[PDB]
C-alpha cells in the first residue's frame, strides 16, 4: 500500500498519463473498465505457459512459400551452431523440431541438462514443438540469402516474468446553455443535438439562434421523435455548436456501461474544430477547462430470380458502394438469405433501423442463428469492416472479434496497429476488442512489446483518446511481468532522453554549423556518461538490443527539421558483427502517418506471399513516440536517388540516365551479385510502383526514394503526401530506373518484361483482396490522417484498384499506367526539383 502506491507511480511514467487523475470525468466508466480488465488479465496471466512465454518463439503455420523452397537445395538446411568459438555447421531437415536438433548436436556429434537454441545476437529463441522451417527468423535468413547462426545456451529463468500479487415518453434533453470564457465580427449561434448510432443520425433538434456572447443561455427542452425505449445501447447524444459552420462538439453515451439511461446534470467541455475523423466520435470531454467552450444540459426520466440477382448484386459491391433505401429494405426483408453469405454482414447490419427497439430485437434473434458466420473461414477485411465507425452495436462487433480469436500471433502482428486504432470506434471503454488486444498482448511478449508502443503512441498525442488507451495499457502492464516492466522502463528512459536532444538541437539552428556538431557531440557525450541505461531494446525491433552510443558516427542531418542520425553499438556480445544499430530521431513529421503506411506495406508483402510473390519491399521500422516526434530505423548501406545524381551531375542540371546503373555496378564486388542487385532493383521497383500507386503516394521526389548498395529500392517519409493543371504520375519509374532494366524511349528488354509481368502479378494479387485494402485505407484516413475532410478521399483506392473490372482489362489498365511513366520521363521530377527549390 505504501509500496503499492509507488508502483502506480511507475506505471504512470511508463504509461505517459496518470490513469487516476480524475479531474476529467463526468462519470466512472474508466474506473469501471480498469476494474473490468482485472479478470481477463489474470485469466491470461494464469493461462499462459511460462517457458514458452519467457522465450516467445516467433513462428507461423503458413506454408513455406515457393520462392523459399526453390532456394532450399536437396531438402536440408545448414544451422551454424556456436558456443565459445566452438562452432559446427549441421545439415538439418526442414521438418525437424528444435529439441530434435539438439539430439543431433548433443546426442550425435559427441538426466541431461536441458538447454535451447537462441539466435546469435538477439532475444530470439527457436524452441517449442514447431518445425525449423516454420520459424520466421529462418524464413528471413533464407529470403535474404543469410546463414542461420545460433548459440547453444541456457533458457531464461521464467520466474523473472512473474508479476506483483493483487417508458414511451419521447426522449428529451434540456439545454441549459453554453460557456466560453473568451470568444474570438459579431455572431449568432445555435446548439445542434443529434442522437447517433454508428455515424447514422437517428434524430435531430436545434435551438433558436441567440447572439454570440461569452455566456449564452437557452433553458429550452429539446424533445426528440425517438422514444426512450427505442434507444439502442451505444447511442450517443452528440452536441454541436454552429455559427453556417461547426465550431465545437462533444458527445455523451445516452445509455451507460451499466445499461442505465443517463440521468442528471452535466457540464461538458468541448472540442474545437480545425481547418470524417475518429475524434468526432469520442466520449471523452476536453481536459483543458480554462480555454474550452463548455455546454450545460439536463436529463430526466425463397424469392424471384430477379430479386435474388438484385440481392446478389448488392452483396457483391465494394464496401464504399453506398446503399440506397431500396437496397436496405431488400437486405432486411430477406435477412435470413443474407445471413447465409458472410461477405454481406456489413451491408445487412447497415440496413438495420437501430433506432427502433423491436427491429434491434429481431437483429439479435437473427444473430442467435449465425451458424454460417461462425463456421466460415476468417476474412480479415470483412472482420475489420464490422469494427469500423459504421457499427456501434456491441453484439455485431462481438462477432468480428470472435473471428479474430482464431488468428495466430504472426497474423495478429500484421493487423495489430490497425486493431489498436480500431478501439477509437468502440462506443465503450470496455469492449470485446480491447480485451482481445489485452489477452494477445499478455499471451506473447512480441505482441505485448508492440501493443505498449502503439497504445503509448496514442496516449502521448490524442487528448480525445488518451484516457481509454491508458486504461488498456495500464491493464496490460500489470500482466507482462517484472522483466518487461523493467525493459519498458529502460526503453522509455532512453527515448525520453534522446527526445530532449533532438528538440534542443532543432532550436539551435535555422545548413549545419560547426558549433552545432560540437553541441551534439557534447550533449550526446554527457548522456552517455551516467544518464543512459546499460542497454535497451530497440522499440521497432524488440529482439535487437542496442548498447552504447557510437558517438563518432552520430550527427545531425541537413534537412530543415534537422533530425538526429544516431548509431549504437550492439549490446549482445554473441552478435556476429560490429555493425551499428542506426536510429533516426526526428521532430516535425507526423510519423503516425508513416506507421500506418509502413504496416500496410507489410500487409501487402503478406498478400503476395499467398501468391508466391516477393517484391522485396524494405518497410523499415517506425515508432511514433509523441506529437510530431519519433524514431526511424536506419536501413544500412543506402542513399537517395537524388544524391546519386548529385554525385555525377551535381547541385542542379540535366538528370542523367547513366548514373544509377553506374553507381550500382561501381558498388557490386562481382558481376554475380550485380545481376542479383539488378534482379533486386527490378523486383523492388515494381513492388513500390504498385504499392505506392494504390496507396496514392506514387508521385514522389527522388529525394524521398532510396536504394541499398545491393539494389534494393525503397520509398521514405510518408507524412502529409496525401494532401490535395499540374503534371503528375502514378509512380516513379524514371529513365534511370529503366536504364538499369535496359530500355530507352519506347524500347523493351527481358528485365523490363520481367518488370511489366511482376507488376501485373502484384497488382492483381492486391485486387484479390480489394475489400481488405479498401477498409484498411478507409480506417487509415479516419484515425491517422488529419485533413480527412471528405469520404471522396477514400474513393481514390477503389479507382486505383479498378473495382468492377475483369482480371484482364485490369491487366491492360496497369500497363497504361507504366506507359505514362515512360511517356512522362524526367519532367515531373524536374518539376519537383523546381517546386522543392522554386516557390
Ligand atoms: N519522415 C521521414 N522519414 C524518413 C526520413 C529519412 N530516412 C532515412 N533513412 C536512412 C536509411 O534507412 C531508412 C531511413 N534517410 C533520410 C531520410 C530523409 C533524408 N535521408 C537521407 C539519408 C541519407 C542521405 N540522404 C538523405 C526522413 N523523414
From Swiss-Prot:
It comes from the Eukaryota. Residues 696-704 are annotated as: Catalytic loop. The modification Phosphothreonine is found at residue 770. Keywords: Angiogenesis, ATP-binding, Cell membrane, Chemotaxis, Cytoplasm, Disease variant, Endocytosis, Immunity, Inflammatory response, Kinase, Lipid metabolism, Membrane, Nucleotide-binding, Phosphoprotein, Serine/threonine-protein kinase, Transferase. Residues 167-300 form the C2 PI3K-type domain. GO terms for molecular function: 1-phosphatidylinositol-3-kinase activity; 1-phosphatidylinositol-4,5-bisphosphate 3-kinase activity; 1-phosphatidylinositol-4-phosphate 3-kinase activity; ATP binding; ephrin receptor binding; identical protein binding; protein kinase activity; protein serine kinase activity. Changing residue 831 to S: In IMD97; loss-of-function variant unable to rescue reduced T-cell activation when expressed in Jurkat PIK3CG-deficient cells. Residues 302-479 form the PIK helical domain. It catalyses: a 1,2-diacyl-sn-glycero-3-phospho-(1D-myo-inositol) + ATP = a 1,2-diacyl-sn-glycero-3-phospho-(1D-myo-inositol-3-phosphate) + ADP + H(+); a 1,2-diacyl-sn-glycero-3-phospho-(1D-myo-inositol-4,5-bisphosphate) + ATP = a 1,2-diacyl-sn-glycero-3-phospho-(1D-myo-inositol-3,4,5-trisphosphate) + ADP + H(+); a 1,2-diacyl-sn-glycero-3-phospho-(1D-myo-inositol 4-phosphate) + ATP = a 1,2-diacyl-sn-glycero-3-phospho-(1D-myo-inositol-3,4-bisphosphate) + ADP + H(+); L-seryl-[protein] + ATP = O-phospho-L-seryl-[protein] + ADP + H(+). Pathway: Phospholipid metabolism; phosphatidylinositol phosphate biosynthesis. Residues 550-826 form the PI3K/PI4K catalytic domain. Pancreas, skeletal muscle, liver and heart. ATP binds at residues 582-591, 617-625, 714-722. Residues 74-154 form the PI3K-RBD domain. SMART domains: PI3K_C2, PI3K_rbd, PI3Ka, PI3Kc. Activated by both the alpha and the beta-gamma G proteins following stimulation of G protein-coupled receptors (GPCRs). Activation by GPCRs is assisted by the regulatory subunits (PIK3R5 or PIK3R6) leading to the translocation from the cytosol to the plasma membrane and to kinase activation. Inhibited by AS-604850 and AS-605240. It holds the Pfam family PI3K_rbd. It is found in: Cytoplasm; Cell membrane. Residues 715-734 are annotated as: Activation loop. One of its GO terms (cellular component) is phosphatidylinositol 3-kinase complex, class IB. Belongs to the PI3/PI4-kinase family. Candidate target in therapy for inflammatory diseases. Selective inhibitors and protein ablation are anti-inflammatory in multiple disease models such as asthma, rheumatoid arthritis, allergy, systemic lupus erythematosus, airway inflammation, lung injury and pancreatitis. Phosphoinositide-3-kinase (PI3K) that phosphorylates PtdIns(4,5)P2 (Phosphatidylinositol 4,5-bisphosphate) to generate phosphatidylinositol 3,4,5-trisphosphate (PIP3). PIP3 plays a key role by recruiting PH domain-containing proteins to the membrane, including AKT1 and PDPK1, activating signaling cascades involved in cell growth, survival, proliferation, motility and morphology. Links G-protein coupled receptor activation to PIP3 production. Involved in immune, inflammatory and allergic responses. Modulates leukocyte chemotaxis to inflammatory sites and in response to chemoattractant agents. It is linked to Immunodeficiency 97 with autoinflammation: An autosomal recessive disorder with variable features. Affected individuals have childhood-onset antibody defects, cytopenias, and T lymphocytic pneumonitis and colitis. Some patients may have features of hemophagocytic lymphohistiocytosis. Heterodimer of a catalytic subunit PIK3CG and a PIK3R5 or PIK3R6 regulatory subunit. Interacts with GRK2 through the PIK helical domain. Interaction with GRK2 is required for targeting to agonist-occupied receptor. Interacts with PDE3B; regulates PDE3B activity and thereby cAMP levels in cells. Interacts with TPM2. Interacts with EPHA8; regulates integrin-mediated cell adhesion to substrate. Interacts with HRAS; the interaction is required for membrane recruitment and beta-gamma G protein dimer-dependent activation of the PI3K gamma complex PIK3CG:PIK3R6. This is Phosphatidylinositol 4,5-bisphosphate 3-kinase catalytic subunit gamma isoform. It comes from Homo sapiens.
